[PDB]
C-alpha cells in the first residue's frame, strides 16, 4: 500500500544518508545509519556537491552514465 509523506519526512527518509544528514536532524540520521551500517552510492545532486564531484545532471550526466557502464562491465 503506497504511503503519502510530507516533504520533510520524505526528505528525511531518503536512501542516501549524506543528503538526509545535510538537510536536518543530523544526529538521528547519523545514529540510524551507523547502527544500520548504511552505504551511500552518491546518486543524487547533494552528495556529489558535497564530495566535489560532477553532479549527475546536465553536462555531468553523460559522465556518470559512463561510470555506470564501467561498473556494469
Amino acid at each position: 500500500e503506497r504511503e503519502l509523506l510530507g516533504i520533510t519526512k520524505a526528505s528525511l527518509a531518503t536512501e542516501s544518508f549524506i543528503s538526509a544528514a545535510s538537510f536536518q536532524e543530523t544526529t538521528r540520521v547519523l545514529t540510524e545509519a551507523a547502527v544500520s551500517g548504511k552505504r551511500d552510492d552518491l546518486r543524487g545532486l547533494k552528495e556529489n556537491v558535497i564530495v566535489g564531484r560532477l553532479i549527475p545532471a546536465g553536462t555531468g550526466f553523460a559522465y556518470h552514465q559512463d561510470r555506470q557502464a564501467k561498473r556494469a562491465q
Binding site: 545532486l45 553532479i55 545532471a57 546536465g58 555531468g60 550526466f61 553523460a62
Partner: protein
C-alpha cells in the same frame, strides 16, 4: 521544457526547477 520551448533533454534537473518555480512566488502569497 518551458524555459526552452522544446521537449526536455536528458539530464535536466527538473526537481530543482520545480522547487524553485513553486518557492519563488511565496513572497507574493498572503442554480440558474
Amino acid at each position: 521544457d518551458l524555459a526552452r520551448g522544446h521537449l526536455v533533454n536528458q539530464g535536466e534537473a527538473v526537481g530543482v526547477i520545480a522547487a524553485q518555480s513553486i518557492g519563488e512566488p511565496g513572497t507574493q502569497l498572503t442554480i440558474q
